[PDB]
Structures are given as structure tokens and as C-alpha cells.
Amino acid sequence: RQVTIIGAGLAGTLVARLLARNGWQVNLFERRPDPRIETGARGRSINLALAERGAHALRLAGLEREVLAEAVMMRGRMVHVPGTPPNLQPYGRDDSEVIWSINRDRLNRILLDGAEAAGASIHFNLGLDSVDFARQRLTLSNVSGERLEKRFHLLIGADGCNSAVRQAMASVVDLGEHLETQPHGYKELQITPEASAQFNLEPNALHIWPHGDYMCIALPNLDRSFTVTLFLHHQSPAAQPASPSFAQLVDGHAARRFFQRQFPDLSPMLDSLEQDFEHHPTGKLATLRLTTWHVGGQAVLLGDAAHPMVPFHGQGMNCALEDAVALAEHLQSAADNASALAAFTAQRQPDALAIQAMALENYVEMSSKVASPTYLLERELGQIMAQRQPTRFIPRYSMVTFSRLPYAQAMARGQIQEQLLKFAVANHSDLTSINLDAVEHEVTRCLPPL
């Protein structure tokens, strides 16, 4: 059984390992050069939040130990707001609930080694150009433009949010594609080990600078450098045309004044802010949903290729790793590749839609809009119910971040919990008019333990 994978990123390299371990002949093609070839280059790859979902997918592949050896433990959040230095807000309810920060290039190199150790052949410096589904052949382009034609039996599209495989599929089947762009862009910035230490930025934490309609978030690296992401409107809306947006930050000097005003404890650590701002492009935020992820038994999409999402729950990589495991499982036990791909799509598509929406709801949190009094009372009640019934009432964030519950079931339980809270608080001022024992009974009736 032979398979061709396009894209030696996170999902593609993991599924290569799993399939090769299961006895598949795996050929993996990647447009970029092999990052394991030693150069003088200082890598500027971002650090990623690896949660229990991703960690478990790596465990199944036998790689968790190697990845975590090169990852920084984030025990909690540091929320930077004016008035006092931040204190750690620890994760969940014990020490075992942490998030790991792993550098993208480090993870990629570990996955590549893992894929080759399992028997996969990885071919770099070759970009997928086109696919011929009738004759079962695809075309790759090399660095100078030479076009190489190859046979495939099964094509896995793991080539990212602008997947060339997906583009090829659209020419033979209606993907039912819907694109939802968001008004925020992002810019990746860097903190050196020296800057971070000078201003005492805690390495073992996730750092956030909230500011209503815009914000920054930073994740640590092994060498004490941090990667910072600014999220900010591309343009100022028609109302509030003076509100901050990238269009006002016409150059690095404007960027610097923006940070000095809005993020004063962060600006001094951004040594290369001006250059980073001008040299790096402003990224776009979008969600892309497809009704179908496969063409018969010939081709399938996974990871960012199948379901681009906004980066606001730190789950795109975690979802991509989950995808790789599921795809390998379905391909190993299916009647033909066509059955495997349909079964895989039916399992993972509802979960992808769920995290895409929950990421957007996490993204919608980033707003200057105040919390309703109703909302605050619901939150207080939910914290009490979480204490009294910790196996039934679990905040949706913890279900997503610290468990392996399928995304769609996390969203379903969150819906039940929110309905329960909405009716318990409906026409009550404060908490003292709410019968907490009666509410706890409703929690027991409506939410089975996990």
C-alpha cells in the first residue's frame, strides 16, 4: 500500500510516521529545503501552544518524550495590564494541567527524524504544481522550474491553509467552500533572551497583553527568547475612524509609538520592533469550511489544508495532529481508500467545525465590550458548580485545552452548561436568591460525568 503526502509540516510529517509504521510505502514531498541541514541561520519560527490533545497524538506516535524535552512548561497565564506587575493565574486545578510551548522548527525537525526513522522517504525542494486525477499523476516543480511527473495511488494533502492539493480537488469536485474573513490581522515579533531577562519576563508562563479590540500574546522558547503576536484591525471601522489599526502604522516609527503608548511594559523588550514591523508581512485571519475533504479514494485533505481557522484558541496544530492520527487509523482498517476517506471525513469534520467556531468565540472575546451583569452572575454560579461537581461541570476552555474530549462534544457540553446557567440566573439579582442545591441537582440531571 502506497501513499504520497504533500507537505512536510506538522500533520503531514506525523501521518507519514504513523503510516510508515503501519507498513505503508510513504513518499513525502515538501516545497521547502530540509531544515535539519545545518546553516548559520537564526530561525525566527514562532512558538506554539501544545495541549493535551496534541501531546497525546504525539504519544501514540512514540514521539511525546522527544518533543517535550525541547518544550517549555507553561504553568499558567501572566496577564499584563496597567497598575501592578502580573501574578501567575495557574492553569485549571492542579499541577498536571499545563500547556507546553514548543518551537515550530524544533517540532518540525523532530517529526521529520521520526518519519524517516519509521521508513518514510522525504523529498524536499519540490512544490506540488498540479494533479491529474484521471490518469492518477501529479506534477512537482523543482527550484529552477523543472517539472517532474509522478504516479500516485493515494494523495494526502497536508500542505497548509493555501493547499495546492485542495486547489486541484476543486477542479474535479465541488468542495462546498465557504470563506469567512475576519477584520483583524496579525504581526509576529521577537523578544531576545537578553531583553526578556532584563525585564524579568517569566519563562514558565503564557503571557497576554489584553487591550480590548487588539492584544498581544507571547510564548517562550528554550533559549529564553519569546515570540510575540500582535492582533489588530487591518483598517479602522467607519465609526471610530481614529481607533487603532495597521493602516495607521505606516512604518516602524509609527509602530514604536503605538507600542510605547498602548503596551508600555512590552515595548522596551521589542528591540527589533521597527525592522520586524516593516520586513515581516501582516498576516490575515480567516476561517475556511469545506463540505467534502476527499475525492473518492484518490485524495484527502487534513490539518490546515482541510480547515483553516483563526489562531485564537491555540488549537490549529493540536487539531492537525489529532487529524493525522484519525486518518492513519481509518486508512489502516478500511475496505478501500474511498471508504477510509469518507469515514475519516465524517469523524473529523464535525470536530473541525466545532473548534473553528470555538476559536472564533475565543476571538470574539477580544472586544472592548463590557461584560453584562447577567454574564458576571452566570460566571460566578458556574464556578460554584464546577467546585461542587468537578466531574460534571467543566469550563469549556478546560475541556478543549486539558482533555481529549472530541471538540464537538466539548461544544455540546458547553451548550448544555450555558443553557443551565442562563435559566438558573434568569430573573435573579445577585447570588443569594439562587438555590444552589437545586441548581446542583440540575447539573447532576443534565450532565453525565466525564
Ligand SMILES: Cc1cc2nc3c(=O)[nH]c(=O)nc-3n(C[C@H](O)[C@H](O)[C@H](O)COP(=O)(O)OP(=O)(O)OC[C@H]3O[C@@H](n4cnc5c(N)ncnc54)[C@H](O)[C@@H]3O)c2cc1C
Ligand atoms: C500566529 C499563529 C499562531 C498560532 N499558534 C498556535 C498555537 O499556539 N497552537 C496551535 O495548536 N496552533 C497554532 N497555530 C496554528 C498552527 O500553526 C497551524 O494550525 C498548523 O501549523 C497547521 O499544520 P499543518 O501541518 O496542517 O500545516 P503547516 O504546518 O502549514 O504545513 C504545511 C506544509 O506544506 C508545505 N507546502 C505548502 N504548499 C506546498 C506545495 N505546493 N508543495 C509542497 N509542500 C507544500 C509547507 O511548506 C509546509 O511545510 C497558530 C497559527 C498562527 C498563524
